[PDB]
Design goal:
Layout (H helix, E strand, L loop, with lengths): L24 E9 L3 E9 L7 E9 L5 H17 L8 E5 L6 E5 L4 E2 H7 L9 H20 L12 E4 L3 E4 L15 E2 L4 E2 L6 H6 L4 H16 L13 H9 L11 H10 L10 H14 L3
Antiparallel strand pairs: 1-2, 2-3, 3-5, 4-5, 6-7, 7-8, 9-10
Helix pairs in contact: 3-5, 3-8, 5-7
Bound molecules: the ligand Cc1ccc(NC(=O)c2ccc(CN3CCN(C)CC3)cc2)cc1Nc1nccc(-c2cccnc2)n1.
Organism: Homo sapiens
Protein name: Mast/stem cell growth factor receptor Kit
Family: Belongs to the protein kinase superfamily. Tyr protein kinase family. CSF-1/PDGF receptor subfamily.
Length: 297
């Protein structure tokens, strides 16, 4: 959680142990695509077990991507390697960096992206219930606490960047190059960038600073998305001059109908204008642990 240092991924070395024979990959359907990159479902052979086919996700540069994007993908690969493999973050499995297009291989998450999952399961609210939502809030906070412990900042925390897999385990991801931010209305032009403004802390919007605390703000917005079962934040409030003024003034979202009081309390603290008053992910983990225990029986 040291806001005075950061991990420069170009200084991270690429561990050759990750290198995987690209001829042992069989590419499938597109899971996401941006301008210079895409994620596809694929099959990997002898990736973990010698004579076993396993489904994976593969992030690749399109032929139309430049060195800048290859560097970014390599940096992302090194960051994932640095983070290591954890229950609540997407797991790196390998890479193909030579002899073809640069590819990064991770686990495949059988329930796909959490935002789509919530939207699909909105009616079922097997069925989705409160404890599922609490579990997702807990696991995302847990994963983010780990990221912060590694002195890493997400910068785009949102339901769309969470995946869901076996046993309803969430995995923090970052589509990065592989999201079409040009045609995603959740990304708004601000200056010479398309930014996830509705998820962003005021200090990020106005001063372009991202911190452990701005990730916590985004987590608050995520909680809102979660307990609204995938609704877009600030309903009936398009990102314009009024929006910026209102956020600066102190306008905040009301509680989702399905949020327990303490979960909304967390949201409100995450959206404190003062970053120093926001909870840490470590704190949030404890709070949600308690709520989950209380919400059982
Ligand atoms: C194939 C791949 C390659 C790279 C990544 N990388 C990440 O998921 C990731 C997560 C966190 C960080 C940490 N990082 C720290 C610094 N900041 C600024 C950015 C975030 C970096 C990369 C994921 C994947 N996996 C991936 N990506 C998108 C979708 C899917 C997917 C979709 C549907 C079903 N199963 C899997 N799977």
């Amino acid at each position: 959680g040291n806001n005075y240092v950061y991990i420069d991924p170009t200084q991270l070395p690429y561990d050759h142990k990750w290198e995987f024979p690209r001829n042992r990959l069989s590419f499938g359907k597109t899971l996401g695509a941006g301008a210079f990159g895409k994620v596809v479902e694929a099959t990997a052979y002898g990736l973990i077990k010698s004579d076993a086919a396993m489904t994976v996700a593969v992030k690749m540069l399109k032929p139309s991507a430049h060195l800048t994007e290859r560097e970014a993908l390599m940096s992302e690969l090194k960051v994932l390697s640095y983070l290591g493999n954890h229950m609540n973050i997407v797991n790196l499995l390998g890479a193909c960096t030579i002899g073809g297009p640069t590819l990064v291989i991770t686990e495949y998450c059988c329930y796909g992206d959490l935002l789509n999952f919530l939207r699909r399961k909105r009616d079922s609210f097997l069925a989705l219930d409160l404890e599922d939502l609490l579990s997702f809030s807990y696991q995302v906070a847990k994963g983010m606490a780990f990221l912060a412990s590694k002195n890493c900042i997400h910068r785009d925390l949102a339901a769309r960047n969470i995946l869901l897999t076996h046993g309803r385990i969430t995995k923090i991801c970052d589509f990065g190059l592989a999201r079409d931010i040009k045609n995603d209305s959740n990304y708004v032009v601000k200056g010479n960038a398309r930014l996830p403004v509705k998820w962003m802390a005021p200090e990020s919007i106005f001063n372009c600073v991202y911190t452990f605390e701005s990730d916590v703000w985004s987590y608050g917005i995520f909680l809102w998305e979660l307990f609204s079962l995938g609704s877009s934040p600030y309903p009936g409030m398009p990102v314009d001059s009024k929006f910026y003024k209102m956020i600066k003034e102190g306008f905040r979202m009301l509680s989702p109908e399905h949020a327990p009081a303490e979960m909304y309390d967390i949201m409100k603290t995450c959206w404190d204008a003062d970053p120093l008053k926001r909870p840490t992910f470590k704190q949030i983990v404890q709070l949600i642990e308690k709520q989950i225990s209380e919400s059982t029986n």
